[PDB]
Amino acid sequence: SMACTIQKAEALDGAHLMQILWYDEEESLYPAVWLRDNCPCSDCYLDSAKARKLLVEALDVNIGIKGLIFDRKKVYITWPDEHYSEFQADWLKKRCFSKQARAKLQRELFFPECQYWGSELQLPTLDFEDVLRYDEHAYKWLSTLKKVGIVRLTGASDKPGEVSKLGKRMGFLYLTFYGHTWQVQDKIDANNVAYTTGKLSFHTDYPALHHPPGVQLLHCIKQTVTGGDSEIVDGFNVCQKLKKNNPQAFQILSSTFVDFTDIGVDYCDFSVQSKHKIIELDDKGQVVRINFNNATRDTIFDVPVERVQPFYAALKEFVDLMNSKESKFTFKMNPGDVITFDNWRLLHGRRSYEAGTEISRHLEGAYADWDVVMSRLRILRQRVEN
Amino acid sequence: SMACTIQKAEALDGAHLMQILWYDEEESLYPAVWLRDNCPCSDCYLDSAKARKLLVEALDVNIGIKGLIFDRKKVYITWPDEHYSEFQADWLKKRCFSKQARAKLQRELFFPECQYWGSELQLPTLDFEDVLRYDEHAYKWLSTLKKVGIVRLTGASDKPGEVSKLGKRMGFLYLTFYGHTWQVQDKIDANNVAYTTGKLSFHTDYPALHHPPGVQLLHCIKQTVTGGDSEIVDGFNVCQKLKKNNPQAFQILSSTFVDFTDIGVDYCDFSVQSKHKIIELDDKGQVVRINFNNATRDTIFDVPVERVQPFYAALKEFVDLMNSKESKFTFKMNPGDVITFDNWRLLHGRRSYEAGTEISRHLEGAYADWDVVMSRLRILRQRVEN
Numbered sequence: 213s214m215a216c217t218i219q220k221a222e223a224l225d226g227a228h229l230m231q232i233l234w235y236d237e238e239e240s241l242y243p244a245v246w247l248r249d250n251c252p253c254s255d256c257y258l259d260s261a262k263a264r265k266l267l268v269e270a271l272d273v274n275i276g277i278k279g280l281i282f283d284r285k286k287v288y289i290t291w292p293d294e295h296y297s298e299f300q301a302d303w304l305k306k307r308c309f310s311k312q313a314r315a316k317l318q319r320e321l322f323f324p325e326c327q328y329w330g331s332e333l334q335l336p337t338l339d340f341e342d343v344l345r346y347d348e349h350a351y352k353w354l355s356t357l358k359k360v361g362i363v364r365l366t367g368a369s370d371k372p373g374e375v376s377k378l379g380k381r382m383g384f385l386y387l388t389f390y391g392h393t394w395q396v397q398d399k400i401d402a403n404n405v406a407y408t409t410g411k412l413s414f415h416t417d418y419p420a421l422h423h424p425p426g427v428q429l430l431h432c433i434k435q436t437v438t439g440g441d442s443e444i445v446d447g448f449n450v451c452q453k454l455k456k457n458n459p460q461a462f463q464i465l466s467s468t469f470v471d472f473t474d475i476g477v478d479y480c481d482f483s484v485q486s487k488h489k490i491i492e493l494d495d496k497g498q499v500v501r502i503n504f505n506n507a508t509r510d511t512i513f514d515v516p517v518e519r520v521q522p523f524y525a526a527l528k529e530f531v532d533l534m535n536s537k538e539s540k541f542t543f544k545m546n547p548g549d550v551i552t553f554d555n556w557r558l559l560h561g562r563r564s565y566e567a568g569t570e571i572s573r574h575l576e577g578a579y580a581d582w583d584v585v586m587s588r589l590r591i592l593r594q595r596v597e598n
Numbered sequence: 599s600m601a602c603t604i605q606k607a608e609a610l611d612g613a614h615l616m617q618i619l620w621y622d623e624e625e626s627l628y629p630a631v632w633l634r635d636n637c638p639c640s641d642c643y644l645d646s647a648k649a650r651k652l653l654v655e656a657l658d659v660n661i662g663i664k665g666l667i668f669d670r671k672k673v674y675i676t677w678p679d680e681h682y683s684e685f686q687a688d689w690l691k692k693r694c695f696s697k698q699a700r701a702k703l704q705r706e707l708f709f710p711e712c713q714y715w716g717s718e719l720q721l722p723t724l725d726f727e728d729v730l731r732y733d734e735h736a737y738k739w740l741s742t743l744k745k746v747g748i749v750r751l752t753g754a755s756d757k758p759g760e761v762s763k764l765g766k767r768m769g770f771l772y773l774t775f776y777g778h779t780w781q782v783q784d785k786i787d788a789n790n791v792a793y794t795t796g797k798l799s800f801h802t803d804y805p806a807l808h809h810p811p812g813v814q815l816l817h818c819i820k821q822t823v824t825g826g827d828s829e830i831v832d833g834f835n836v837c838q839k840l841k842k843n844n845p846q847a848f849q850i851l852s853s854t855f856v857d858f859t860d861i862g863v864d865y866c867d868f869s870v871q872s873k874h875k876i877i878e879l880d881d882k883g884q885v886v887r888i889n890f891n892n893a894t895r896d897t898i899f900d901v902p903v904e905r906v907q908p909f910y911a912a913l914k915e916f917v918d919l920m921n922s923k924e925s926k927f928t929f930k931m932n933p934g935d936v937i938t939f940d941n942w943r944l945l946h947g948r949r950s951y952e953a954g955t956e957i958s959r960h961l962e963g964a965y966a967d968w969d970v971v972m973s974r975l976r977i978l979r980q981r982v983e984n
């Protein structure tokens with residue numbers, strides 16, 4: 213391509229930059245120290261690992277290019293200490309330091325596209341066995357999970373072991389104190405409100421951990437007619453609405469560290485404590501995670517007395533917005549359904565149902581880490597586009 | 599105790615606060631909304647789970663106490679809607695909203711005590727089998743790990759499976775793409791610079807993950823005489839020195855997102871990308887994690903061209919400080935040694951050694967999550983103090 217073909221390469225600015233003029237007349241700049249740091253030769257770079265061997269200690273941060281020649285596809289550089297490097301035009305083009313080039317590459321790496329939703333949600337749905345068997349379907353599954361925050365998979369069995377298959381399709385599941393997988397049913401001496409017939413208001417799972425599960429998988433084995441409907445909301449959409457409608461409540465919830473706790477016995481004995489801001493912003497002010505489960509919020513609340521009541525007032529505004537008919541999407545799982553969802557972004561809940569002498573309702577759940585999921589998504593995209 | 603015995607309890611400030619006068623004449627204040635939110639009765643609180651059943655939707659954020667009576671050990675409160683609550687004096691005392699009381703409780707929950715060190719480090723050392731067998735020893739192990747950032751365990755076997763035993767003693771290990779455990783030895787077509795005979799400069803493990811491993815365990819099975827010494831530094835101590843000596847370099851490294859990558863095949867096939875600030879600060883400006891492995895830092899660098907060279911200049915200052923003779927502690931692992939260390943705080947490295955026709959050097963490593971470790975520490979403290 214004219215865009216990836218070198219018309220001219222030159223050392224500039226005390227030889228501390230290389231400038232490429234592409235055949236399309238666009239220009240790109242590459243710092244000499246970055247080129248040296250990223251020399252792909254066998255001394256500097258371990259090809260079997262696609263990893264840098266060069267040490268920081270080896271890198272002269274004031275380095276300039278000693279000499280440069282080029283052809284249409286490569287640049288060949290000598291360094292002051294006689295080290296010698298070759299860089300490929302396409303590799304350079306991809307890594308161009310312009311804002312537009314860097315942003316393009318970041319989109320390709322991290323799939324940021326996000327579709328916010330409320331009660332109008334058309335629940336994305338795919339077949340379970342299709343997703344296990346076919347990369348095209350597994351790609352649609354994970355890409356949709358990332359973009360929309362939820363996908364329903366239909367046609368699974370009505371037996372345990374289905375979420376474990378999805379785990380393997382991803383890579384591996386995320387072990388917690390509740391096990392590799394866990395059974396959501398009414399239990400005697402329940403160690404968690406989940407394991408009762410009570411209503412679960414909107415929550416994220418596991419804010420008692422400093423790194424809550426990124427992705428949740430929930431498979432319906434048995435459903436009851438007496439209640440137990442599912443509800444979901446898009447936390448990122450709700451947070452946007454809250455910031456606009458009640459900036460005071462938004463500021464409180466995005467700045468106040470709330471203590472979470474979980475003590476008991478399951479996979480092993482545990483005594484877990486964390487602190488999170490309910491609305492967790494990145495350094496640019498964008499909401500990246502919601503951390504909220506009313507069951508596991510501690511009785512311990514580590515704020516001055518005068519900030520307590522305003523916190524609760526803020527929290528109520530947030531919960532009320534989540535409950536609003538424009539925000540929430542309600543549905544009922546049937547046996548063989550699996551929902552797979554972003555546990556950092558969505559909040560989820562369930563309606564109460566009636567206890568009985570045997571088990572009338574049984575879900576199997578598991579977690580996965582977003583890095584594990586994104587890894588699989590990157591691989592699938594390449595396989596499906598190749 | 600006079601300190602935990604109630605002399606007077608009273609509703610104040612439109613009945614929106616409860617004030618306790620203790621028998622020691624100290625006074626404590628408890629917001630009415632917090633008391634209501636934390637009612638311990640069976641409607642509001644699931645005792646088997648030690649979790650809140652009360653929903654935010656149930657909580658009137660403007661609530662005041664309707665009536666209150668007390669004795670030396672308890673307060674008995676009626677609410678406007680006729681709900682009724684009992685709170686224990688000791689439970690109240692622990693949760694007092696004063697800065698001193700809250701800070702005390704936070705220290706008890708999170709064990710913040712930290713002892714910084716340099717080359718003068720006296721490496722804490724305990725016996726392996728003692729730590730497996732005895733809670734007193736396992737408590738010393740984890741408390742020291744937290745405070746100092748490293749403990750050496752001696753007298754393990756020279757066979758794989760030792761770190762897995764420590765994993766079970768903690769609770770469970772943290773699975774990654776390199777496996778439940780992994781073998782540090784020279785490998786053909788190595789998928790990681792670790793699996794070669796090369797020098798590893800100071801690094802943290804796994805900044806390619808958004809949640810790097812909190813704790814690392816490394817067991818020496820076979821050691822070589824040709825090199826392979828270990829080196830460690832206290833990253834929190836180095837960061838303090840860097841901030842003082844070079845505040846510009848500190849600001850760059852604590853604000854610049856660096857891209858990390860890992861692509862290959864091990865436990866399964868993986869294509870991993872992350873972004874981290876090398877020096878990661880909490881919201882109060884305290885360093886909480888270092889994220890740095892020069893091998894896995896990407897060729898992709900997502901900053902404007904003019905910020906590139908100053909970044910490298912900053913990075914070199916940081917690495918030079920880590921290498922300084924006052925900062926680093928050097929030692930050589932023998933067969934049967936295990937080091938267990940804080941992978942968020944320490945950086946570690948190894949000297950190069952000579953390749954040969956069979957394996958002359960073999961470590962087995964594994965990871966654990968700090969929340970898993972802290973859970974065990976809390977439990978052990980209670981067992982050993984009880």
Ligand SMILES: C[N+](C)(C)CCCC(=O)O
Pocket residue numbers: 390394396404406416417418419420505508577
């Ligand atoms: C379903 N379960 C018990 C694994 C987790 C529930 C939520 C959390 O406890 O924060």
Ligand SMILES: C[N+](C)(C)CCCC(=O)O
Pocket residue numbers: 776780782790792802803804805806891894963
């Ligand atoms: C030892 N190993 C391969 C599990 C991890 C090394 C470090 C990292 O790759 O960041």
Ligand SMILES: O=C(O)CNC(=O)C(=O)O
Pocket residue numbers: 396406407412417440441442560561562575
């Ligand atoms: O039971 C349901 O439908 C949903 N369960 C949960 O959200 C849980 O166990 O945390």
Ligand SMILES: O=C(O)CNC(=O)C(=O)O
Pocket residue numbers: 782792793798803826827828946947948961
């Ligand atoms: O081999 C050693 O002594 C240390 N190894 C590592 O730090 C690693 O594999 O990341």
Ligand SMILES: [Zn+2]
Pocket residue numbers: 251252253254255256257295296297
């Ligand atoms: Zn080179």
Ligand SMILES: [Zn+2]
Pocket residue numbers: 415416417560
């Ligand atoms: Zn849940």
Ligand SMILES: [Zn+2]
Pocket residue numbers: 637638639640641642643681682683
């Ligand atoms: Zn109550």
Ligand SMILES: [Zn+2]
Pocket residue numbers: 801802803946
């Ligand atoms: Zn390492």
